[PDB]
Design an enzyme around this catalytic site. Structure first.
Site, PDB file in Angstrom:
ATOM      1  N   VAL A   1      -4.699   0.158  10.756  1.00 59.30           N
ATOM      2  CA  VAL A   1      -4.741   0.883  12.049  1.00 59.30           C
ATOM      3  C   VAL A   1      -3.322   1.344  12.434  1.00 59.30           C
TER       4      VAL A   1
ATOM      5  N   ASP B   1       0.183   2.904  -5.052  1.00 59.61           N
ATOM      6  CA  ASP B   1      -1.060   3.162  -5.821  1.00 59.61           C
ATOM      7  C   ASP B   1      -2.196   3.391  -4.817  1.00 59.61           C
ATOM      8  N   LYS B   2      -2.239   4.580  -4.257  1.00 66.44           N
ATOM      9  CA  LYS B   2      -3.220   4.909  -3.215  1.00 66.44           C
ATOM     10  C   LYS B   2      -4.632   4.875  -3.812  1.00 66.44           C
TER      11      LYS B   2
ATOM     12  N   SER C   1      -1.029   3.636  10.323  1.00 66.22           N
ATOM     13  CA  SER C   1      -0.387   4.863   9.800  1.00 66.22           C
ATOM     14  C   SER C   1       0.193   5.668  10.951  1.00 66.22           C
ATOM     15  N   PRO C   2       1.450   6.136  10.846  1.00 62.95           N
ATOM     16  CA  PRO C   2       1.968   7.070  11.842  1.00 62.95           C
ATOM     17  C   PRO C   2       1.537   8.530  11.634  1.00 62.95           C
ATOM     18  N   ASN C   3       0.773   8.800  10.568  1.00 58.95           N
ATOM     19  CA  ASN C   3       0.522  10.163  10.033  1.00 58.95           C
ATOM     20  C   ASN C   3      -0.948  10.569  10.129  1.00 58.95           C
ATOM     21  N   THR C   4      -1.763   9.847  10.908  1.00 62.17           N
ATOM     22  CA  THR C   4      -3.144  10.263  11.278  1.00 62.17           C
ATOM     23  C   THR C   4      -3.236  10.215  12.804  1.00 62.17           C
TER      24      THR C   4
ATOM     25  N   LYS D   1      -3.411  -4.488   9.483  1.00 57.90           N
ATOM     26  CA  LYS D   1      -2.018  -4.065   9.255  1.00 57.90           C
ATOM     27  C   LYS D   1      -1.532  -3.339  10.503  1.00 57.90           C
TER      28      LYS D   1
ATOM     29  N   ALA E   1       0.842  -1.202   0.000  1.00 55.88           N
ATOM     30  CA  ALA E   1       0.000   0.000   0.000  1.00 55.88           C
ATOM     31  C   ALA E   1       0.878   1.254   0.000  1.00 55.88           C
ATOM     32  N   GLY E   2       0.339   2.293  -0.602  1.00 54.50           N
ATOM     33  CA  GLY E   2       0.979   3.618  -0.591  1.00 54.50           C
ATOM     34  C   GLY E   2       1.497   3.996  -1.959  1.00 54.50           C
TER      35      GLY E   2
ATOM     36  N   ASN F   1       7.950   9.346   4.998  1.00 53.27           N
ATOM     37  CA  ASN F   1       6.746  10.004   4.436  1.00 53.27           C
ATOM     38  C   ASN F   1       5.805  10.420   5.548  1.00 53.27           C
TER      39      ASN F   1
ATOM     40  N   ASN G   1       3.707  -1.799   8.888  1.00 51.78           N
ATOM     41  CA  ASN G   1       3.724  -0.419   8.405  1.00 51.78           C
ATOM     42  C   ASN G   1       5.112   0.200   8.652  1.00 51.78           C
TER      43      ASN G   1
ATOM     44  N   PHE H   1      -2.698  10.249   4.381  1.00 54.13           N
ATOM     45  CA  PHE H   1      -3.879   9.636   3.742  1.00 54.13           C
ATOM     46  C   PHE H   1      -4.493  10.609   2.745  1.00 54.13           C
TER      47      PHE H   1
ATOM     48  N   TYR I   1       2.466  11.534   4.191  1.00 54.27           N
ATOM     49  CA  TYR I   1       1.391  11.902   3.237  1.00 54.27           C
ATOM     50  C   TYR I   1       0.093  12.268   3.957  1.00 54.27           C
TER      51      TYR I   1
HETATM   52  C1  LIG Z   1       8.109   7.124  -2.001  1.00 50.48           C
HETATM   53  C2  LIG Z   1       7.726   7.987  -3.186  1.00 50.48           C
HETATM   54  N1  LIG Z   1       8.463   7.580  -4.385  1.00 50.48           N
HETATM   55  C3  LIG Z   1       9.703   8.035  -4.783  1.00 50.48           C
HETATM   56  C4  LIG Z   1      10.533   9.072  -4.085  1.00 50.48           C
HETATM   57  O1  LIG Z   1      10.943   8.669  -2.808  1.00 50.48           O
HETATM   58  N2  LIG Z   1      10.074   7.466  -5.877  1.00 50.48           N
HETATM   59  N3  LIG Z   1       9.053   6.592  -6.248  1.00 50.48           N
HETATM   60  C5  LIG Z   1       9.127   5.854  -7.426  1.00 50.48           C
HETATM   61  C6  LIG Z   1       9.565   6.506  -8.568  1.00 50.48           C
HETATM   62  C7  LIG Z   1       9.727   5.787  -9.747  1.00 50.48           C
HETATM   63  C8  LIG Z   1      10.113   6.432 -11.001  1.00 50.48           C
HETATM   64  C9  LIG Z   1      10.386   7.919 -11.072  1.00 50.48           C
HETATM   65  C10 LIG Z   1      11.860   8.171 -10.735  1.00 50.48           C
HETATM   66  C11 LIG Z   1       9.978   8.515 -12.408  1.00 50.48           C
HETATM   67  F1  LIG Z   1       8.718   8.193 -12.782  1.00 50.48           F
HETATM   68  F2  LIG Z   1       9.987   9.870 -12.300  1.00 50.48           F
HETATM   69  F3  LIG Z   1      10.790   8.165 -13.413  1.00 50.48           F
HETATM   70  N4  LIG Z   1      10.132   5.740 -12.088  1.00 50.48           N
HETATM   71  N5  LIG Z   1       9.866   4.396 -12.143  1.00 50.48           N
HETATM   72  C12 LIG Z   1       9.972   3.857 -13.426  1.00 50.48           C
HETATM   73  C13 LIG Z   1      11.199   3.925 -14.098  1.00 50.48           C
HETATM   74  C14 LIG Z   1      11.266   3.464 -15.391  1.00 50.48           C
HETATM   75  C15 LIG Z   1      10.135   2.939 -16.002  1.00 50.48           C
HETATM   76  C16 LIG Z   1       8.943   2.869 -15.320  1.00 50.48           C
HETATM   77  C17 LIG Z   1       8.850   3.338 -14.037  1.00 50.48           C
HETATM   78  C18 LIG Z   1       7.516   3.257 -13.362  1.00 50.48           C
HETATM   79  C19 LIG Z   1       9.554   3.673 -11.016  1.00 50.48           C
HETATM   80  O2  LIG Z   1       9.363   2.475 -11.064  1.00 50.48           O
HETATM   81  C20 LIG Z   1       9.442   4.401  -9.766  1.00 50.48           C
HETATM   82  C21 LIG Z   1       8.948   3.789  -8.615  1.00 50.48           C
HETATM   83  C22 LIG Z   1       8.844   4.505  -7.473  1.00 50.48           C
HETATM   84  F4  LIG Z   1       8.414   3.880  -6.356  1.00 50.48           F
HETATM   85  C23 LIG Z   1       8.028   6.672  -5.306  1.00 50.48           C
HETATM   86  O3  LIG Z   1       6.938   6.082  -5.323  1.00 50.48           O
HETATM   87  C1  LIG Z   2       5.246   6.920   0.430  1.00 45.54           C
HETATM   88  C2  LIG Z   2       4.609   5.839   1.259  1.00 45.54           C
HETATM   89  C3  LIG Z   2       3.249   5.851   1.474  1.00 45.54           C
HETATM   90  C4  LIG Z   2       2.591   4.844   2.197  1.00 45.54           C
HETATM   91  N1  LIG Z   2       1.229   4.871   2.333  1.00 45.54           N
HETATM   92  C5  LIG Z   2       0.653   3.819   2.936  1.00 45.54           C
HETATM   93  C6  LIG Z   2      -0.762   3.736   3.020  1.00 45.54           C
HETATM   94  O1  LIG Z   2      -1.532   4.529   2.447  1.00 45.54           O
HETATM   95  N2  LIG Z   2      -1.287   2.638   3.653  1.00 45.54           N
HETATM   96  C7  LIG Z   2      -0.516   1.655   4.262  1.00 45.54           C
HETATM   97  O2  LIG Z   2      -1.088   0.705   4.828  1.00 45.54           O
HETATM   98  N3  LIG Z   2       0.806   1.695   4.177  1.00 45.54           N
HETATM   99  C8  LIG Z   2       1.363   2.731   3.562  1.00 45.54           C
HETATM  100  N4  LIG Z   2       2.728   2.777   3.462  1.00 45.54           N
HETATM  101  C9  LIG Z   2       3.533   1.717   4.086  1.00 45.54           C
HETATM  102  C10 LIG Z   2       3.951   0.586   3.148  1.00 45.54           C
HETATM  103  O3  LIG Z   2       2.819  -0.122   2.676  1.00 45.54           O
HETATM  104  C11 LIG Z   2       4.877  -0.414   3.836  1.00 45.54           C
HETATM  105  O4  LIG Z   2       4.167  -1.003   4.925  1.00 45.54           O
HETATM  106  C12 LIG Z   2       6.182   0.199   4.339  1.00 45.54           C
HETATM  107  O5  LIG Z   2       6.631   1.256   3.494  1.00 45.54           O
HETATM  108  C13 LIG Z   2       7.285  -0.826   4.525  1.00 45.54           C
HETATM  109  O6  LIG Z   2       7.642  -1.462   3.281  1.00 45.54           O
HETATM  110  P1  LIG Z   2       8.923  -0.929   2.428  1.00 45.54           P
HETATM  111  O7  LIG Z   2      10.091  -0.817   3.394  1.00 45.54           O
HETATM  112  O8  LIG Z   2       9.095  -2.016   1.385  1.00 45.54           O
HETATM  113  O9  LIG Z   2       8.516   0.394   1.781  1.00 45.54           O
HETATM  114  C14 LIG Z   2       3.367   3.783   2.720  1.00 45.54           C
HETATM  115  C15 LIG Z   2       4.751   3.798   2.498  1.00 45.54           C
HETATM  116  C16 LIG Z   2       5.375   4.777   1.767  1.00 45.54           C
HETATM  117  C17 LIG Z   2       6.860   4.670   1.531  1.00 45.54           C
HETATM  118  O1  LIG Z   3      -0.646   8.268   4.074  1.00 43.72           O
HETATM  119  C1  LIG Z   3       0.346   8.139   4.786  1.00 43.72           C
HETATM  120  O2  LIG Z   3       0.970   9.078   5.358  1.00 43.72           O
HETATM  121  C2  LIG Z   3       0.774   6.764   5.151  1.00 43.72           C
HETATM  122  C3  LIG Z   3      -0.114   5.828   5.572  1.00 43.72           C
HETATM  123  C4  LIG Z   3       0.361   4.592   6.121  1.00 43.72           C
HETATM  124  O3  LIG Z   3      -0.353   3.691   6.543  1.00 43.72           O
HETATM  125  N1  LIG Z   3       1.730   4.489   6.240  1.00 43.72           N
HETATM  126  C5  LIG Z   3       2.643   5.420   5.844  1.00 43.72           C
HETATM  127  O4  LIG Z   3       3.840   5.263   6.026  1.00 43.72           O
HETATM  128  N2  LIG Z   3       2.112   6.594   5.373  1.00 43.72           N
END
Ligand SMILES: CCn1c(CO)nn(-c2cc3c([C@@H](C)C(F)(F)F)nn(-c4ccccc4C)c(=O)c3cc2F)c1=O
Ligand SMILES: Cc1cc2nc3c(=O)[nH]c(=O)nc-3n(C[C@H](O)[C@H](O)[C@H](O)COP(=O)(O)O)c2cc1C
Ligand SMILES: O=C(O)c1cc(=O)[nH]c(=O)[nH]1
Ligand SMILES: [Cl-]
Ligand SMILES: [Cl-]
Ligand SMILES: [Cl-]
Ligand SMILES: [Cl-]
Ligand SMILES: [Cl-]
Ligand SMILES: [Cl-]
Ligand SMILES: [Cl-]
Length: 368
Positions: A185, A71-72, A187-190, A227, A68-69, A117, A256, A121, A119
Site C-alpha cells: 500500500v 524481479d517484478k 508505492s509512491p507511483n500509483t 509494506k 521487491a522491484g 524510480n 518502501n 507497477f 516505474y
Molecule cells: C534500479 C534499476 N537498476 C539499475 C539502474 O539504476 N541497475 N540495476 C542493476 C544492474 C545490474 C547489472 C547491469 C549493470 C548489467 F546487467 F547491465 F550489467 N549487472 N549486474 C550483474 C553484473 C555482473 C554479473 C551479473 C549481474 C546480474 C547486476 O547485478 C545488476 C543489478 C542491478 F540491480 C537495476 O536493477
Molecule cells: C527500481 C525500483 C522498483 C521498485 N519497485 C517496487 C515494487 O514493485 N514493489 C515494492 O513493494 N517496492 C518496490 N520498490 C521498493 C524496494 O522494494 C525497497 O523498498 C526500496 O527501494 C528501499 O530499499 P533499497 O534502498 O535497498 O533499494 C522498488 C525500488 C526500486 C529501486
Molecule cells: O512500480 C513502481 O513504481 C514502484 C513500486 C513501489 O512499491 N515502490 C517503488 O519505489 N516503485
C-alpha cells in the site's frame, strides 16, 4: 580475499563501467536476464548457523533478502538464490498486465548512492507470473524447506475501481505459490495507493485480504505482511500498528521508497518525480522500523529495508526491530558481491557485539 577481490573489482570498475554504457532501465533488464541465466560471480560466503532466523512460519538460512522491484515478474528467482540471498521477494504483481509509466522512469544519483524510480507497477500480471511460478513450484517447495523462502508482493492496476478486489485476486492467484504475501500500500507511483494506509480503508482492505488468505488450503496458506511508506505521519503509524494487532497481520515491511528529498542530495536528477531509494533513505527507514517495533510491542515481525549496503546497515535495522532485511539499490552500485559482503560484515559485527546470532540482536536497542 577472493571475496573482497570480486567485491572491489565489481564496486570500483565493473559496475561503474557497465552503468556508464547503459540507460538505467536497460541495465535493470539486462541484470534480470543475466541473473535468470545464472551468469553470476561465485557466492563464496558459507551461511553459518548464527545467520539463521525462524520467523513468519519459516526457516531463513540468512536474513538478507532481495527487495521487491528487482524481479517484478518472477523471472530470476533461482538466480537470486544463487547470489546468496536468504529469501526472494518478487513483484509488485498487478491483476491485469500493465505497461507502467512512460520511459524514462528510472534515474541514477551515483553521487548520493541513490536511485529515483517511477516505474508505475509495470507488471506481466497475475496469470503470467502464476504460470512462471507453477513451472518451478516443487523446486520452490524444496528451497523453502532448505531455508530459502519466497515472498510475493501484490499491487493494484492503475484503472482498478476496487483496490481491495485487486489485492484479493492476488491472494487467490499467487497466495498458493508464496511463503508470504505483501500488501503493497506504499508505492509512491500509483495515484491514491498510499491513502490505503489510512485506518478505516486499511482495516476494510486487510480484513478482505486475510479472509481470502484464510480460505486457502493449509499447505498453500501464506503469511500476510503490509509494506509501508517512510513518509507516514505519527498518526498514520499509530493507526497501522492498531490495525495490524487488531487483525493479526503476520508482519510489516518497513519501508518502501520516499517521496521526500532529504537536504543534501547532489545528483543532477534529484528533482525527478518518484520514489528515492539507497543511502539517503537508510536512516529514515531505520527510524520507521524502530517506531513500528515499539508500537507493536516487538510482537509483529518486521522486514527492514531501505539503504542497506553493509553489515552495519543490516545490524542497525535488526537492532531497531527487524527480524530480516532486504536490499535492492546497493546491488545497482556494488553488483552481486554485495550480498556476501553484507552477510560477512553482519556475522563479524554480531560476534564483536556479543550476540550468539541474528535472533539475539532483533530489537536489542529497545532493551538498552
Ligand atoms: C534500479 C534499476 N537498476 C539499475 C539502474 O539504476 N541497475 N540495476 C542493476 C544492474 C545490474 C547489472 C547491469 C549493470 C548489467 F546487467 F547491465 F550489467 N549487472 N549486474 C550483474 C553484473 C555482473 C554479473 C551479473 C549481474 C546480474 C547486476 O547485478 C545488476 C543489478 C542491478 F540491480 C537495476 O536493477
Ligand atoms: C527500481 C525500483 C522498483 C521498485 N519497485 C517496487 C515494487 O514493485 N514493489 C515494492 O513493494 N517496492 C518496490 N520498490 C521498493 C524496494 O522494494 C525497497 O523498498 C526500496 O527501494 C528501499 O530499499 P533499497 O534502498 O535497498 O533499494 C522498488 C525500488 C526500486 C529501486
Ligand atoms: O512500480 C513502481 O513504481 C514502484 C513500486 C513501489 O512499491 N515502490 C517503488 O519505489 N516503485
Ligand atoms: Cl515462525
Ligand atoms: Cl541456490
Ligand atoms: Cl540516470
Ligand atoms: Cl497451487
Ligand atoms: Cl507526524
Ligand atoms: Cl522533502
Ligand atoms: Cl515525487
Amino acid at each position: 580475499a577472493m571475496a573482497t577481490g570480486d567485491e572491489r573489482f565489481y564496486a570500483e570498475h565493473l559496475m561503474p563501467t557497465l552503468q556508464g554504457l547503459l540507460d538505467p532501465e536497460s541495465a535493470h533488464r539486462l541484470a534480470v536476464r543475466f541473473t535468470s541465466l545464472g551468469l553470476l560471480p561465485r557466492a563464496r560466503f558459507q551461511d553459518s548457523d548464527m545467520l539463521e532466523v525462524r520467523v513468519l512460519g519459516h526457516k531463513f538460512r540468512n536474513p538478507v533478502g532481495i527487495a521487491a522491484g528487482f524481479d517484478k515478474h518472477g523471472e530470476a528467482v533461482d538466480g537470486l538464490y544463487k547470489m546468496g540471498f536468504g529469501f526472494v521477494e518478487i513483484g509488485s504483481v498487478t491483476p491485469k498486465p500493465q505497461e507502467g509509466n512512460p520511459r524514462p522512469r528510472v534515474f541514477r544519483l551515483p553521487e548520493d548512492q541513490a536511485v529515483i524510480n517511477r516505474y508505475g507497477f509495470n507488471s506481466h500480471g497475475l496469470s503470467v507470473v502464476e504460470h512462471r511460478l507453477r513451472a518451478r513450484q516443487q523446486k520452490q517447495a524444496k528451497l523453502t524447506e532448505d531455508g530459502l523462502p519466497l515472498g510475493v508482493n501484490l499491487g493494484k492496476n492503475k484503472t482498478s475501481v476496487d483496490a481491495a478486489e485487486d489485492y484479493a485476486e492476488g491472494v487467490r492467484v499467487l497466495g498458493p505459490l508464496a511463503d508470504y504475501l505483501v500488501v503493497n500500500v506504499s508505492s509512491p507511483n500509483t495515484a491514491g495507493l498510499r491513502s490505503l494506509q489510512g485506518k478505516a480503508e486499511l482495516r476494510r482492505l486487510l480484513t478482505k485480504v486475510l479472509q481470502e488468505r484464510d480460505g486457502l488450503r493449509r499447505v498453500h496458506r501464506p503469511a500476510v505482511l503490509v509494506k509501508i511508506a517512510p513518509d507516514l505521519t505519527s498518526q498514520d503509524k499509530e493507526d497501522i500498528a492498531s490495525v495490524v494487532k487488531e487483525l493479526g497481520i503476520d508482519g510489516l515491511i518497513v519501508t518502501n521508497t520516499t517521496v521526500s528529498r532529504p537536504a543534501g542530495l547532489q545528483g543532477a536528477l534529484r528533482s525527478e518525480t518518484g520514489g528515492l531509494s539507497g543511502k539517503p533513505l537508510r536512516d529514515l527507514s531505520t527510524q520507521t522500523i524502530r517506531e513500528m517495533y515499539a508500537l507493536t510491542q516487538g510482537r509483529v515481525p518486521i522486514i527492514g529495508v531501505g539503504g542497506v549496503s553493509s553489515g552495519q546497515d543490516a545490524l542497525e535495522k535488526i537492532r531497531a526491530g527487524a527480524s530480516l532485511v532486504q536490499l535492492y539499490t546497493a546491488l545497482t552500485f556494488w553488483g552481486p558481491p554485495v550480498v556476501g559482503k553484507v552477510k560477512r560484515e553482519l556475522e563479524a559485527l554480531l560476534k564483536e557485539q556479543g550476540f550468539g546470532g541474528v535472533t539475539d540482536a532483533i530489537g536489542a536497542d529497545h532493551r538498552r
